[PDB]
Each structure stands twice: as C-alpha cells, then as structure tokens.
Design a protein around this ligand. Structure first.
Ligand SMILES: O=C(O)CCc1ccc2c(c1)OCO2
Ligand SMILES: O=C(O)CCc1ccc2c(c1)OCO2
Lengths: 153, 153
C-alpha cells in the first residue's frame, strides 16, 4: 500500500504484448506495446517508469522477469527492490484481470480512432488514469496525492 | 495554469533526435529518442505524456509541429491547448539550451553503461528528475507538489 509500490502486468491483444505497470495504491498505470515480453524490454520499461515516478518496489509479473539478469540490472541501476508478484492476498489477481479486461474494452472503444495498436493503448492509459472513480478522485489524482503526502515528511 | 504548462524541446545527438517535454514550473522532464521529428511522433509523444500527467497547455517546439494536423489531432484528443513556444520571456530559451547541454552531459556520463542511445536517454531522464537542487527539492518532488497543491483548490 505504500507510495512506491508498483505491479507489473503483461496482457495480450492482436498477437502483441501490452506491458502495464500499476501503482498499486492508486490504480494509476503506464503501459507500452512490445513485440514480446523479454527481459530487455521489461528492464527498459522499468527504467522509464523509475525516471518518471519514485518507484521503490516492483512486484514482477512472472518468474522469468524476476530471474532475468537484465531486469535485475535495471532494478539495481534505478534503486528498485524487485519482488515476486505472488498474490498472497488472492483478490490482488482478480483486480489485475479486471483491469486487463477494462483496458482491452477501452482499446476496443478507441481502436477505430487509432491506426496503430500502440496509439489505442496510450488512449486507454489516458482514459483509465483520468476516470473519476465513485466528488470521486481519478487514479491520476490519487497517485499524486499519495506521493505528495509521502514527501511531507 | 502553471501546474499544467509543458514545453516541447527537440535536441540531436548521434544523428538521432531526442524529443523532450519539460514541465515548466518544476523542471521535470519526460524524453524519448525518435528517428526524426515528424508530426506523428510528436503527436504520439504528447498523447503518452497527457495520459501520465495533467497536461493543459503545451508550448510547441517549432512551427512545423505547431501546424501539424496530426499534432493538432492529438492535442484535441487529449484536451491540450497547443501554443507556440516563442520565448516571450528570453531567459526561457537559455534555460532550455542549458538543459539540453546538461542532458547531453549525463548522456555522455552513462553512455557506456547502455548498449542503445534510448537507454542512456532514459538514465539521463532519471538522473535529471531525481537530482536535488539542492533542504533542496528534486524536479520530481516539485512537479508532484505543484499538482497536488493544484488538486487541493
Ligand atoms: O522523491 C520522492 O519520493 C517523490 C519525488 C519524485 C516524484 C516523481 C519522480 C521522482 C521523484 O523521480 C523522478 O520521477
Ligand atoms: O487531474 C489533475 O489535475 C491532476 C491529476 C492527474 C495526475 C496524473 C494524471 C492525470 C491526472 O491524468 C493523467 O495522469
């Protein structure tokens, strides 16, 4: 639940991979399309993410990325504690499956407006992060308020 | 705004283009390497940026991107007001030249640790956003505080 905890989530669409990082406490996401989930892509995506948000802990999405020496190199470089993504509380997993289904639905709703899947995915990141949940807050609002509160201290 | 104002900046290294968005009030940046600055690339980069931060105004980096139909379509889609980037304030310009030189210096300092230019650029984005400047705050801390303060009004 802390401000720096993220979860990696890899889902498939149109024979391609969508890599998602979710900020567990807020539901805020960043996502990319990649031809396939290799250590190198995962490493690069974490590096990008950690340059943009204070990523302290990452729950890796599978044991291959947990093992990967490139992923471990990027976590070391960027000051990130790599953890497994084992859902010791089971509702965690249902939350992810639900987000994957939500995102693919958004992708479907914008698919026409975008020539490449990668554009549709960024439109879906946009809609997802701005959606007011519930005076309800968006995930965008939440992540910023969580990290600002954390900074003060 | 201020909280929502971003400036686009395009700089070259190794025959490649580095596209940068700077959050004016904090100095926080996001950046990408692209083969060349076209409207489509710039459009896609803005869509990614606006799905991640609440981007209200962008000062475009040149009149081609200002004019571009695709850039205008992305700005319309993501709710962004496009403006020219003319240094009405002249110190604005020198501020950017100095960041470009600073990013390039970081790039040179990490270039060895990275096979690809895109990796070195993301390392530089990381070092830039985390640097305390410095009881000194980082650009990452500033942008979060600026937007949190804004959400609480
Ligand atoms: O330092 C903190 O815990 C929060 C500050 C912060 C916010 C965004 C960042 C960042 C640091 O590094 C780059 O993106
Ligand atoms: O809503 C605001 O003014 C700030 C909240 C916020 C923060 C990050 C976001 C976002 C919205 O949408 C994209 O990523």
């Amino acid at each position: 639940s802390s401000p720096g905890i993220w979860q990696l989530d890899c889902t498939h669409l149109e024979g391609k991979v969508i890599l998602v990082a979710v900020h567990v406490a807020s539901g805020y996401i960043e996502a990319e399309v990649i031809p396939a989930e290799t250590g190198q892509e995962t490493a690069y995506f974490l590096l990008k993410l950690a340059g943009r948000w204070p990523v302290k802990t990452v729950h890796t999405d599978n044991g291959s990325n947990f093992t990967s020496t490139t992923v471990k190199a990027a976590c070391w470089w960027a000051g990130i504690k790599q953890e497994d993504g084992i859902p010791y509380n089971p509702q965690s997993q249902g939350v992810i499956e639900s987000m994957n289904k939500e995102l693919k639905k958004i992708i479907g709703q914008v698919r026409d407006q975008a020539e490449h899947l990668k554009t549709a995915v960024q439109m879906a990141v946009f809609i997802h992060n701005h959606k007011r949940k519930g005076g309800g807050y968006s995930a965008g609002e939440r992540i910023v308020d969580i990290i600002a509160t954390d900074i003060q201290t």
